[PDB]
């Protein structure tokens, strides 16, 4: 009993250390966009003279967004959308091109890197009002609708979006721009699934020299990362995982691991539900690892 | 009796490996907590550097006043309650003419007009500002061995993020031990200033104390040792915060932490004071910092586990 416990407790600690590393990685975009939101809300917060604390034009705000992309290579992008006439009169900017404005002048910049890496901007006019469901079960405008409805930060499950002519699966990290209790807009950043897959492959290598495999499962059950096969990213976990596993995914409470042994295959399954800063999201790190890679010392002792 | 030697060594190994795993988990949580202030102030730097970066037309990408930059700093304090403060210093005449501001009080300016705001919370929790005029140019060694202006001198010298070992500063009439998280404000390859935020040692101590209560049910202790060997945290004794780890450790321990590779664990077993010590050095992002987590476990607690392990094995 006690020996198996001490071995199991090592396994869980090492897995917990990797959850913490993934959390650090996934909390970073939210902290970045929190900063932009805490600066941009000052456009609508009066100071001692009764005028906004920050008197930045739209071009200066976009400069902040562009600087974010330039100086955070791990972020796929940075984007901001204001409510209609949130901080100025949309109609005065309608028809101005190349600045991220909707046709009616709404402020909707999406900044990302062109082919040569230099930041470019697109208006989000097409997606910001779209409530259509993307192929991964995510509402097209969820990155904006979620902060608007909840007035809190939102991390969005994997969804495909077209970026410079290619389809990129990504997850968004979003914070509302609040002036008092008024939702004025939202600012966010995406991480690509390719980036997060690379993170999870690194994490899995730290567990018994990569003897096992890991999966990162979003709140809707779809795969953010899956070290076994890059082709499964964005798929329902139920379409990759064996019945034993997709069952245990429903047996989970945040921060409490679930530990199981698949008898037919002789491996350990470890499920570590976790959350990310103030986003309220519940993702799950799953570890699948052969018993032999973990319990060799027990085996050695029983050999004596 | 060889078998007994082989069996005991193997039982000890499983215990030793578990504690190493717990130390790695604790280091990973510490890294998560300590990366956060650097990301915040990187955002401040990435906005403020726009005051000197040219746009398409030549004029600067951000035309914001000192008041507006201070509003960004105040907003950071207000909205980041884990942070003790937020502060920024510009080179002389970095983004404007200091002399136009010389003499103006209550805005965080030096006597000569240099921009040097230090924003923190008053007793009512609302942010207030102090100029860093007395510290920004002082290389005096503070009681913890840190230069008074290291928070600025290190980003200036190295042009990269800097995390500073514990140092005391007067805030609101009281001496507070803190560690700063600093980044340079670069326009191109030119240092124009730096921006930073402090965490109090009280905050880090509290973190480590809460974690120690989950290690052998609080029976042991933890410490965090800064790059110069002084205590960032020490769960046993609040009064050692800032003190040399060598002052509270009876072995050769702190000396050959210098010789230990980042992310390599090292046990030091002292049967004489009944202590098992585990050191795990680590770094934080690209700061270059070298801090060490220490776990201290009563030997008798591990001795007791070995007995139960040995017995359970003998029973079956
Ligand atoms: C990709 N958008 C920027 C359009 C939304 C966030 O994923
Ligand atoms: C919306 N207002 C700017 C009027 C309130 C600020 O708190
Ligand atoms: C306390 N200061 C802000 C003066 C320096 C950073 O520790």
Author numbering:
A (entry chain A): 25 to 328
B (entry chain B): 17 to 332
What did the published study say regarding this structure?
Chemoeffectors are sensed by chemoreceptors that in turn stimulate chemosensory pathways that modulate the activity of the flagellar motor. A canonical chemoreceptor is composed of an extracytosolic ligand-binding domain (LBD) and a cytosolic region that contains the signaling domain that interacts with other signaling proteins. The dCache domain is the predominant extracellular LBD in bacterial signal transduction systems, and it is present in about 15% of all chemoreceptors. To identify the molecular determinants for acetylcholine recognition, we report high-resolution structures of PctD-LBD (with bound acetylcholine and choline) and PacA-LBD (with bound betaine).
